[PDB]
Amino acid sequence: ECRVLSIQSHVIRGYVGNRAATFPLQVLGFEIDAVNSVQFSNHTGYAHWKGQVLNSDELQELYEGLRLNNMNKYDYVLTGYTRDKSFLAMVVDIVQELKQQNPRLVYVCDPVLGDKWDGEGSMYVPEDLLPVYKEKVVPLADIITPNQFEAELLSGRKIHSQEEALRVMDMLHSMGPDTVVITSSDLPSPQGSNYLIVLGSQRRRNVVMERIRMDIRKVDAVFVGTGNLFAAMLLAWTHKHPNNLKVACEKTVSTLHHVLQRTIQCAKAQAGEGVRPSPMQLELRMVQSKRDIEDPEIVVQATVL
Amino acid sequence: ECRVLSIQSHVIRGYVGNRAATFPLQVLGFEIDAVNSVQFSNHTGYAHWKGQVLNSDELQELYEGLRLNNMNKYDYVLTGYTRDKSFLAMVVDIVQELKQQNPRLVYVCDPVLGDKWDGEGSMYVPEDLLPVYKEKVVPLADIITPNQFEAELLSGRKIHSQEEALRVMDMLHSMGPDTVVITSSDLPSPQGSNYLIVLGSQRRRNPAGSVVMERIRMDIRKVDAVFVGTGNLFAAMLLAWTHKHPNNLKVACEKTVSTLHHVLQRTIQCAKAQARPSPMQLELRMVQSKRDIEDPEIVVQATVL
Ligand SMILES: Nc1ncnc2c1ncn2[C@@H]1O[C@H](COP(=O)(O)OP(=O)(O)OP(=O)(O)O)[C@@H](O)[C@H]1O
Ligand SMILES: Nc1ncnc2c1ncn2[C@@H]1O[C@H](COP(=O)(O)OP(=O)(O)OP(=O)(O)O)[C@@H](O)[C@H]1O
Ligand SMILES: [Mg+2]
Numbered sequence: 001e002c003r004v005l006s007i008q009s010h011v012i013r014g015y016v017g018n019r020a021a022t023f024p025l026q027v028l029g030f031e032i033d034a035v036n037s038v039q040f041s042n043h044t045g046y047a048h049w050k051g052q053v054l055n056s057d058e059l060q061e062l063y064e065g066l067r068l069n070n071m072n073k074y075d076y077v078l079t080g081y082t083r084d085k086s087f088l089a090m091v092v093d094i095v096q097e098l099k100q101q102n103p104r105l106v107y108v109c110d111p112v113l114g115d116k117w118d119g120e121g122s123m124y125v126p127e128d129l130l131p132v133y134k135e136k137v138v139p140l141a142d143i144i145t146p147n148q149f150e151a152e153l154l155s156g157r158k159i160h161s162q163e164e165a166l167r168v169m170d171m172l173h174s175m176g177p178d179t180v181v182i183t184s185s186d187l188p189s190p191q192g193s194n195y196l197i198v199l200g201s202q203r204r205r206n207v208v209m210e211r212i213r214m215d216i217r218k219v220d221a222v223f224v225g226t227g228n229l230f231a232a233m234l235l236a237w238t239h240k241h242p243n244n245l246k247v248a249c250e251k252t253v254s255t256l257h258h259v260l261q262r263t264i265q266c267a268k269a270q271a272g273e274g275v276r277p278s279p280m281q282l283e284l285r286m287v288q289s290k291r292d293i294e295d296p297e298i299v300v301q302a303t304v305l
Numbered sequence: 306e307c308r309v310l311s312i313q314s315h316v317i318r319g320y321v322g323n324r325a326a327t328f329p330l331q332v333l334g335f336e337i338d339a340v341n342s343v344q345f346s347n348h349t350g351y352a353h354w355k356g357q358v359l360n361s362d363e364l365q366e367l368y369e370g371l372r373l374n375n376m377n378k379y380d381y382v383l384t385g386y387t388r389d390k391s392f393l394a395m396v397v398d399i400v401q402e403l404k405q406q407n408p409r410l411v412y413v414c415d416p417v418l419g420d421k422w423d424g425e426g427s428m429y430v431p432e433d434l435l436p437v438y439k440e441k442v443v444p445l446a447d448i449i450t451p452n453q454f455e456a457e458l459l460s461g462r463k464i465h466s467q468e469e470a471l472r473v474m475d476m477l478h479s480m481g482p483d484t485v486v487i488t489s490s491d492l493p494s495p496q497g498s499n500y501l502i503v504l505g506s507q508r509r510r511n512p513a514g515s516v517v518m519e520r521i522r523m524d525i526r527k528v529d530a531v532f533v534g535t536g537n538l539f540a541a542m543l544l545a546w547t548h549k550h551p552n553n554l555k556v557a558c559e560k561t562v563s564t565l566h567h568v569l570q571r572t573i574q575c576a577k578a579q580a581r582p583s584p585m586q587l588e589l590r591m592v593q594s595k596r597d598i599e600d601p602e603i604v605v606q607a608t609v610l
């Protein structure tokens with residue numbers, strides 16, 4: 001049994017954070033325990049939203065209960081979006097402790113900080129978080145999944161090309177994580193302008209390095225939860241395929257493809273044909289993608305670099 | 306799309322409340338939205354447990370969020386263990402409005418009040434809840450899943466034989482729900498002393514327009530151990546299987562009870578292997594019962610009443 005302590009948001013309607021991470025990991029047989037960092041009616045991409053958060057003391061309270069029963073032994077830890085600096089610090093103390101309890105623990109960190117829209121990036125988290133991430137979180141992380149913007153912020157240098165991107169990943173590797181994966185980038189593709197690029201690098205002794213590239217066909221709308229889903233599925237596939245970033249990223253990415261495909265279709269069907277689908281209609285068709293998650297048909301071959 | 310609003314407990318580790326009802330319903334294709342009434346480290350049957358609870362005001366706020374985004378359109382509402390009277394009264398108003406929004410909404414209500422342990426029964430929620438359930442909840446419920454003790458508290462009648470059970474079930478129908486299932490009772494079993502009894506009663510109008518009633522009975526072999534979350538699982542699967550077989554209580558129940566069996570069988574084996582088994586080893590082996598949840602092999606046929 002593989003246990004995962006996943007600490008992320010919970011929303012009542014929709015799929016983001018733990019909602020996007022849990023089902024798929026459960027479907028793939030993991031014992032994922034979800035610590036809901038917040039509980040909102042839905043994600044902030046909607047016009048409205050209400051909810052309550054979980055403060056650092058409550059997080060600790062929860063960990064203590066787990067400790068008391070000797071349930072503080074996990075195989076992986078998964079974290080994503082957080083707005084509170086106090087919360088992040090508490091998360092760090094927990095991974096450290098869980099790591100002492102089980103040194104083999106793999107910490108999967110999604111350093112959610114911001115994104116680039118047109119080519120300009122803007123953080124959607126307070127700045128005081130960046131240093132914590134650079135100095136406390138990443139060093140403890142074994143696997144990190146930043147998008148292009150987050151990889152830039154974390155290293156201090158802009159990524160203009162693929163080679164610059166790979167240099168930035170090298171920097172992150174030295175910061176601690178043995179597995180780095182850029183989940184999206186403005187990088188150009190020879191396949192056309194309708195593409196976003198994914199880059200992945202893994203450091204594993206034998207020391208041997210593995211680097212892969214993937215050119216994903218862009219879809220018309222804006223999704224929410226896909227980053228979180230990418231992180232959880234990476235966790236899942238690097239677990240079944242350790243020492244194979246290639247396949248692990250192919251299954252991860254193929255899973256997302258199917259899900260988004262199913263989502264964009266039903267989304268356009270509901271929305272009046274010719275009309276841009278709303279955030280509500282654009283919620284991931286998670287439940288309906290069950291079979292694609294269990295065994296994703298590979299539809300994007302990754303090229304070795 | 307079949308949308309379910311499930312307001313129940315959440316735990317980090319283990320499967321009870323919403324943790325026991327979500328994965329299975331998701332596996333079965335339902336868009337189940339979970340509103341976590343509490344967030345504990347684990348269920349209260351463990352030596353220890355820490356956590357926070359959701360109070361009526363925050364529930365209302367969470368509801369407000371859905372409302373503002375016009376996402377308060379559900380096909381089913383599902384509730385279970387509720388600890389606070391003002392919360393239950395909030396759950397009641399919520400359901401009342403969801404029903405105004407969609408008259409076809411089916412409220413599946415598991416009236417958690419207590420259970421028989423010795424030969425005696427005792428409550429495990431504030432006694433000032435009983436009147437609320439009697440006067441506000443049950444009247445709104447369409448499907449209720451009380452155990453024997455609860456069917457007695459709601460009816461103000463004690464059940465000593467199969468016939469008093471049926472009499473009580475009729476009383477329960479007159480209070481509101483068209484479907485009443487007694488999820489466990491001591492009652493005599495032609496197959497021995499180690500058998501708990503399940504009783505089902507469903508009233509419905511058939512095509513012609515005649516109001517009829519289906520009655521079933523099931524004798525389950527008692528296993529030597531205490532499980533937590535199985536009541537929640539029973540209700541969850543009841544919802545799901547009466548949804549597929551609306552005019553057939555026999556099949557819905559046989560499938561519901563059969564799933565519990567499979568889950569319980571697999572759970573007891575991995576418990577004996579690890580051990581008496583503590584609460585932790587008797588945690589329902591949920592993720593591992595995926596197949597059985599999807600297509601449960603009927604292993605206990607119901608006798609018709
Ligand atoms: N518009 C899209 N078209 C095609 N694929 C997409 C699209 N949006 C997201 N994806 C899929 O989701 C993956 C992650 O991209 P996304 O932008 O959602 O997350 P991110 O910004 O990289 O990370 P995060 O949101 O956690 O900071 C992409 O690699 C791709 O597989
Ligand atoms: N010890 C057991 N042996 C066999 N089956 C069991 C056992 N415990 C629970 N079950 C299964 O779970 C079902 C519900 O029983 P359980 O006692 O868990 O809930 P309940 O007491 O009837 O209702 P609630 O717990 O919600 O108040 C039983 O009908 C049976 O299908
Ligand atoms: Mg992005």
Ligand SMILES: [Mg+2]
Pocket residue numbers: 420421452489
């Ligand atoms: Mg019981």
Ligand code: NA
Pocket residue numbers: 110145146147183227
């Ligand atoms: Na990312």
Ligand code: NA
Pocket residue numbers: 415450451452488489536
């Ligand atoms: Na019950």
